Amino acid sequence: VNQKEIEIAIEYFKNYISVGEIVATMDLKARGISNPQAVISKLIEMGIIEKGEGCYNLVR
Ligand SMILES: [Gd]
Ligand SMILES: [Gd]
């Protein structure tokens, strides 16, 4: 997973606190992330975001 892509996704979830799986996937691809699934998994691993039911929440 690319480091610039990690920084792009982090900034995205900071501005969008709770976002659905499908909107997040669409919006991350729009900001140049071809594989948002991989970046999202890494952000969960890092404790940046948590996964609910088809929704991602910024841990804070
Ligand atoms: Gd939780
Ligand atoms: Gd959760």
Author numbering: 11 to 70
Direct quotes from the study:
Rather, it exists as a stable heterotrimer in which the apo-enzyme PolB1 associates with two subunits that we term PolB1-binding protein (PBP) 1 and PBP2. The PBP1 and PBP2 proteins are conserved in the Sulfolobales and other members of the crenarchaeal phylum and so, since the majority of our studies of the replisome have been performed with proteins from Sso, we chose to study the Sso orthologues, the products of the SSO0150 (PBP1) and SSO6202 (PBP2) open reading frames. In conclusion, over 30 years after its first characterization, we reveal that Sulfolobus PolB1 is not a single-subunit enzyme as was previously believed, but rather is a heterotrimeric holoenzyme. We speculate that PBP2 may facilitate polymerase activity via its interactions with the knuckle on the thumb domain of PolB1, conceivably influencing the position of the tip of the thumb domain and modulating the interaction of this domain of PolB1 with the primer–template junction.
PBP2 was crystallized and the structure determined by multiple wavelength anomalous dispersion (MAD) phasing technique. We note, however, that we cannot detect any direct interactions between PBP2 and either single- or double-stranded DNA.
